[PDB]
């Protein structure tokens, strides 16, 4: 009936989907045409967000759900099975996201109880779970990983990742070089539930950005002028008289796709003048 999130695969071939009926379908789009392939059923509640892993580790898809569980589906020649599952949270799990392929293979999941887990991968069917209890007050909705920025070979990374919640704060995070994550900062400006948070992927440029949308109907694009400037100054994109649900970044012109409001979808580009404009409405 109604689908929730749907993300295309890496090389732009398959396309995973999931909706309230607890079913994660994986179509495949060779030449504009859709063609379902598998229907992975396994959640006692609707599935929320879905995320494909970097083809560097075979072909992996991961889906989270209101069933308090997260499933990771592997593939071994047409064989779409479950190579692991993680039910380490007490409530719904609103979102999932994979860390840039350099930090290895790490999945970041935020639940509706206010926690966050971080599945790292170790050799075989084994997954450790360094978890962040009470990271948000009422719960967590969005999780987005900060771009893979480089500092013996295979350097240590400032493994950061943001995440907004129901407490109205968009907390950034950092892996302390010892073992655990400590929230590097909180971002306030949203007057209601932070619906989604998206770490715009640095086009090589050092001006790292981040965008967020919430029930109030505002989309802010937070910014760190420089590196270690500790500073994130929010700027308003636009306020609609209804809630904004998702926000994803285009890949090159930093075109923000704003999904929220009137069942519509808008696009925005930062103009040569600092101000953000709507380039087109989508339907």
């Amino acid at each position: 009936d109604m689908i929730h999130d749907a993300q295309m695969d890496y090389y732009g071939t398959r396309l995973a989907t999931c909706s309230s009926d607890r079913s994660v379908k994986i179509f495949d789009v060779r030449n504009g045409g859709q063609i379902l392939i598998a229907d992975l059923r396994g959640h006692e509640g609707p599935v929320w967000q879905v995320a494909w892993a970097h083809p560097m580790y075979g072909n992996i898809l991961a889906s989270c759900s209101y069933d308090r569980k997260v499933i990771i589906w592997r593939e071994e020649n047409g064989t779409w099975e479950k190579s692991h599952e993680h039910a380490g949270h007490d409530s719904s799990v609103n979102s999932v996201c994979w860390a840039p392929h350099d930090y290895g293979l790490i999945l970041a999941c935020g639940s509706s109880d206010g926690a966050i887990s971080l599945l790292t991968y170790t050799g075989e069917g084994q997954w450790e779970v360094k978890k962040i209890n009470n990271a948000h007050t009422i719960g967590c909705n969005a999780v987005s990983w900060a771009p893979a920025v480089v500092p013996g070979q295979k350097p240590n990374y400032i493994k950061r990742f943001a995440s907004g919640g129901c407490d109205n704060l968009i907390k950034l995070w950092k892996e302390e070089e010892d073992g655990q994550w400590k929230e590097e900062q909180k971002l306030e400006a949203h007057s209601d539930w932070v619906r989604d948070v998206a770490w715009a992927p640095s086009i090589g440029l050092p001006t790292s950005t981040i965008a967020s949308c919430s029930q109030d109907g505002r989309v802010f694009i937070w910014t760190c002028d420089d590196a270690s400037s500790n500073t994130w100054s929010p700027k308003l994109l636009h306020k609609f008289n209804d809630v904004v649900w998702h926000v994803s970044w285009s890949i090159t012109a930093n075109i923000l796709a704003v999904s929220g409001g009137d069942n519509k979808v808008t696009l925005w580009k930062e103009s040569v003048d600092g101000q953000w404009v709507c380039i087109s409405d989508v339907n």
Binding site: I138, S191, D192, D216
Partner: protein, 423 residues
């Protein structure tokens, strides 16, 4: 072979292919250019953003006038409301007992609509403590009717009689909660359950001083027998064996019923009492019956809260806002500003404009405090829609509202004058 100036004039003006235009008109209706008109002037009208059926019937607008006293202001003859006996109760009748509306309304009709002794006893220390409670009951007696199915049914679920009792208490049903206590060979409960309705420090301490000892090395006691003694302690949520844990399965409004029935933590005003329950718990998002409580809870900062609440206010109906501010303002119930009042009166009086209901527009508009704007609006509203306000909208409204004699004649003629050269 001659459309060359339509390339120089169009180009000299910077006029691009996509030139569109839109303009509202006095009748409060826009005109955007669509190929859908003889000339191409799609004359769309502006949608009211108001949804409540009884506004379209004269009986309401009519009857609701009788409720007021109109008097010309101190700077002109334009009418303004002197005295209005307008209660939320009034509204109750024109609605159906099922909608959250009847609730939101019937609730305020309790929280704010005024309570009163019916006979004529005059002991202020008493009459003040009676209404203090007549309101108390009326409120719980209501919540008991909302959590009704919610719990009444949760009881068909338990082969644990002790738990059943505690659930019967939740419904402020001491009688059937006691009938059970005795019928199960759990008599000592029926006793306390008796004291439950009143405040006695002996019992208070006997339950609490008891509870403290219950966490030593003495288990196998029902979470329910304790929950019940807890109801006697006085404050069940900030308790030594708190009830804050109920939150997971009981809708917030059920817990509240507890803070109001057993939660007397102090013998003070009900208003701040409600405010106490809120301090410990959050509340349903987008819920009007919820907001209404906060509005009743924050008694002195009403306007400060209302305004503060109005920023996430898509739950509180513009008509309700208006109606609230006015039932509070004309009964002396709460503190409202002249700027906020009229601010929210244009709000409503405007939707009624947009709903081609100039009975309501004009009527509401008389609630304006600013003699300038009041005169200002009325002169406008009437000057334009006189015919619409005459011979059939029940024939009198204008005089019924003590409008000015000169304006009626003045504006009327103006139109007959107009129609004079169109016919």
């Amino acid at each position: 072979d001659e459309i060359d100036n339509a390339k120089l004039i169009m180009k000299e003006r910077r006029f691009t292919a996509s030139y569109t235009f839109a303009k509202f008109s006095t009748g409060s209706m826009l005109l955007t250019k669509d190929i859908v008109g003889k000339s191409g002037v799609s004359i769309k009208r502006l949608p009211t953003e108001l949804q409540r059926k009884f506004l379209f019937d004269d009986v309401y607008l009519d009857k609701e006038i009788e409720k007021v006293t109109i008097e010309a202001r101190k700077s002109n003859p334009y009418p303004q409301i002197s005295e209005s006996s307008l209660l939320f109760k009034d509204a109750l009748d024109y609605m159906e007992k099922t909608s959250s509306d009847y609730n939101l309304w019937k609730l305020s009709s309790i929280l704010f609509d005024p309570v009163s002794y019916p006979y004529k006893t005059d002991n202020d220390q008493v009459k003040m403590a009676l209404l203090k409670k007549e309101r108390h009951c009326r409120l719980t007696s209501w919540i008991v009717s909302q959590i009704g199915p919610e719990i009444e049914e949760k009881i068909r679920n338990s082969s644990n009689e002790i738990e059943q009792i505690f659930l019967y208490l939740l419904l402020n049903d001491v009688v059937r909660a006691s009938k059970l206590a005795i019928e199960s060979k759990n008599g000592h409960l029926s006793v306390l359950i008796s004291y439950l309705g009143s405040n006695d420090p002996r019992i208070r301490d006997l339950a609490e001083l008891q509870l403290q000892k219950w966490s030593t090395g003495g288990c196998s006691i029902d979470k329910n027998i304790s929950k019940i003694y807890k109801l006697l302690s006085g404050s069940p949520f900030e308790g030594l064996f708190s009830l804050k844990e109920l939150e997971s399965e009981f809708s917030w409004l059920c817990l509240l019923n507890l803070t109001l029935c057993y939660g007397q933590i102090d013998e003070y005003s009900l208003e701040s009492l409600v405010q106490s329950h809120l301090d410990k718990f959050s509340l349903p998002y987008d819920d009007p019956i919820g907001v209404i409580f906060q509005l009743y809870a924050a008694n002195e900062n009403t306007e400060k809260l209302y305004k503060e609440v109005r920023q996430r206010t898509n739950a509180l109906d513009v008509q309700f806002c208006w109606y609230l501010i006015q039932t509070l303002r004309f009964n002396g119930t709460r503190v409202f500003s002249k700027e906020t009042s009229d601010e929210a009166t244009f709000a409503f009086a405007a939707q009624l404009e947009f709903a081609q209901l100039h009975g309501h527009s004009l009527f509401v508009s008389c609630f304006l405090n600013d003699d300038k704007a009041a005169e200002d609006t009325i002169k406008r509203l009437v000057m334009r829609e006189i015919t619409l306000l005459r011979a059939s909208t029940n024939d009198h409204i204008l005089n019924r509202l003590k409008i000015p004699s000169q304006l009626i004649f003045n504006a009327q003629a103006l139109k007959d004058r107009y129609e004079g050269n169109y016919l």
